[PDB]
Amino acid sequence: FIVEDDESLGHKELKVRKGHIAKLMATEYQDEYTWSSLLNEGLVEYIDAEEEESILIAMQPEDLEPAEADVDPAKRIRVSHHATTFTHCEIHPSMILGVAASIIPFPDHNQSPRNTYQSAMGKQAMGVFLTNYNVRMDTMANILYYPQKPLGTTRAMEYLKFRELPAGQNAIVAIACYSGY
Amino acid sequence: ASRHGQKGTIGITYRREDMPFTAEGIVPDLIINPHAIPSRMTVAHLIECLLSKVAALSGNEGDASPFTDITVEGISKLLREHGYQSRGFEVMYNGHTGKKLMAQIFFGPTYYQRLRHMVDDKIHARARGPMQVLTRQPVEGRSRDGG
């Protein structure tokens, strides 16, 4: 996102505003204002590691924009927006993740290598890989009889189409000591 | 495996009446060992379960997204709003006797995936068979009835 001093009004808020959000949601509900529409409007820019060196980036827009003139103990401990030099804003922190890790529920609540492991098992899984499975004459294929969408999903999974072609079933799990089997 | 690197093979299959039950009549589809939690530190596995339980009760697709303002204490308040011990646990009764289990078990759904390695695909045995031509020793692999 591009963040500039722009509007005399207050501080240095983002270039993109609620208007463009609705403008996009308009084209969304139609299924005119695309991604190229944000890009050529100069509200959003493409940055490589070499260019990243000469910028400062705000994590969340809101949580990283006004100033200080109670708190929930249950919530995590976040830092600050004391920077007034903000040049850009991160669309969403969860976009640092690739396809495999994007399927992990609450990965910010797991010891990091455990996440790297489920990044490999997601491949040794089953389900519908395509809907044309009955037409395809592949060397080997496994289709799960009754797949179920997951009960806990990530905002990112909506785009990975998992909800349509799932990898498992939601099992009623008891975490217990029984027979010892 | 769950979506937290928590893999495993089956140990045994039990029927409904051998299985432990909630007074509600709900029986588990899976029984996973508590031991595989502290060492691993898969807190997100437990949180998935608590959220997944809430979701099924209320007819929602539980947001388990990463950097959010969702709390364990928030979801716990919701699960109590449905009528279950806020932390997931439920008093269960042993299948063989009907007698209550002194411990309350953390029950509820977790999304589990079936993995591409079946035992009947791995199992191998040989007592004489095909031998290599040069070396005159047993051949390699299940397919080739190898040693």
């Binding site: 949601m25 509900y29 | 697709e61 539980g62 947001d63 928030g74």
Partner: peptide, 15 residues
Amino acid sequence: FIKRDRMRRNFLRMR
């Protein structure tokens, strides 16, 4: 707590 999908409903009612 859960994911918000009632925006076929929310967006059609507002616009």
